[PDB]
Amino acid sequence: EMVRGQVFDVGPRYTNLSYIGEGAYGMVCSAYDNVNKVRVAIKKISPFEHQTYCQRTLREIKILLRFRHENIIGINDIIRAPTIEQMKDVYIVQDLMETDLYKLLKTQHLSNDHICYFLYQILRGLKYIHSANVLHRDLKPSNLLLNTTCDLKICDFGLARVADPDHDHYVATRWYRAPEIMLNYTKSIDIWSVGCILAEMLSNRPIFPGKHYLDQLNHILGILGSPSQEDLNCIINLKARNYLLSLPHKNKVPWNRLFPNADSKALDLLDKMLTFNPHKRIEVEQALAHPYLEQYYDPSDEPIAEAPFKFDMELDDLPKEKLKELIFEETARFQPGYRS
Numbered sequence: 520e521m522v523r524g525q526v527f528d529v530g531p532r533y534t535n536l537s538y539i540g541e542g543a544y545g546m547v548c549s550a551y552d553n554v555n556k557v558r559v560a561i562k563k564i565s566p567f568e569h570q571t572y573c574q575r576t577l578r579e580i581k582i583l584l585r586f587r588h589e590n591i592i593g594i595n596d597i598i599r600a601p602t603i604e605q606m607k608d609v610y611i612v613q614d615l616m617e618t619d620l621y622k623l624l625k626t627q628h629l630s631n632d633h634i635c636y637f638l639y640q641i642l643r644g645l646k647y648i649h650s651a652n653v654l655h656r657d658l659k660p661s662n663l664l665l666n667t668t669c670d671l672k673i674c675d676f677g678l679a680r681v682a683d684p685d686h687d688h689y690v691a692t693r694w695y696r697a698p699e700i701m702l703n704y705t706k707s708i709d710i711w712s713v714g715c716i717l718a719e720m721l722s723n724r725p726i727f728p729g730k731h732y733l734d735q736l737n738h739i740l741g742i743l744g745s746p747s748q749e750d751l752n753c754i755i756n757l758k759a760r761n762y763l764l765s766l767p768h769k770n771k772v773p774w775n776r777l778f779p780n781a782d783s784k785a786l787d788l789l790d791k792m793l794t795f796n797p798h799k800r801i802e803v804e805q806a807l808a809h810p811y812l813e814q815y816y817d818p819s820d821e822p823i824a825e826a827p828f829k830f831d832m833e834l835d836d837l838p839k840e841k842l843k844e845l846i847f848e849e850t851a852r853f854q855p856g857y858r859s
């Protein structure tokens with residue numbers, strides 16, 4: 520019940536607690552599921568103090584409960600107090616994953632073969648997410664949970680959205696943030712993230728490690744070269760255009776010069792994923808059909824969404840009190856006596 524001077528209260532079903540890190544908005548523990556007789560992961564979450572925190576929680580729960588994919592983390596169980604007044608923290612029980620791609624790349628140079636099947640699993644999972652008309656919006660090595668080389672699961676859907684190209688209109692992780700976001704909700708933003716994850720697996724370091732968003736653009740252009748007038752026009756904002764000028768013109772660094780030892784087929788796909796123009800950027804089904812993944816690509820073994828995703832009644836400007844009620848309602852099916 521007690522872990523490092525903090526209540527966990529996941530009993531009596533989940534026992535033998537162990538500490539495996541923190542983050543947001545509570546610690547993460549590996550417990551023993553006495554029912555399934557296997558060790559699982561448990562996320563303690565205390566979001567009800569701040570409106571933004573409730574959003575990410577409510578958002579992830581609604582989605583992970585409806586998604587069902589081999590490459591996407593699921594929610595096994597949700598521990599919660601009987602009444603709304605009582606509960607201040609929510610416990611989400613998921614499959615225990617040994618590590619993640621962020622911690623892996625900090626300790627290992629990945630082989631080309633391993634990079635390939637890793638990339639395939641990510642895209643296999645993404646294909647399902649995109650088929651449900653949903654954007655992950657925050658894809659990065661730390662959000663890729665790993666057990667073996669053949670066990671990859673996508674996690675953290677707190678920033679997820681339903682795809683809406685006509686909107687317009689909190690941001691994603693800077694390093695994996697698509698250029699169109701910084702210049703002006705499309706599926707292309709996820710493809711760009713995966714590209715950044717590909718480039719990272721090839722050299723064990725972030726390809727576009729900016730300090731702030733303007734520096735982030737300087738990094739992107741520093742490798743893709745100065746954007747053409749065609750690409751420059753698509754920038755709906757003014758500044759840009761008119762901050763490109765002032766621009767110190769640069770040439771497109773060849774991918775083979777940046778990544779010498781890398782597979783040429785891999786670099787070709789990488790070039791497609793990291794195009795400046797979002798409209799010319801490669802799509803998820805096309806990425807899978809690329810010659811780099813030709814030994815894994817199998818449309819018959821790549822499940823898609825049964826029905827496109829739409830939240831029943833949603834979106835920001837709901838106070839943290841209303842969100843808590845919606846969280847209380849969404850987690851109700853894990854409670855005793857749950858009818859309907």
Ligand SMILES: c1cnc2[nH]ccc2n1
Pocket residue numbers: 539547560592613614615616617664674
């Ligand atoms: C750490 C270890 N395993 C996990 N499974 C789901 C989240 C998580 N975090």
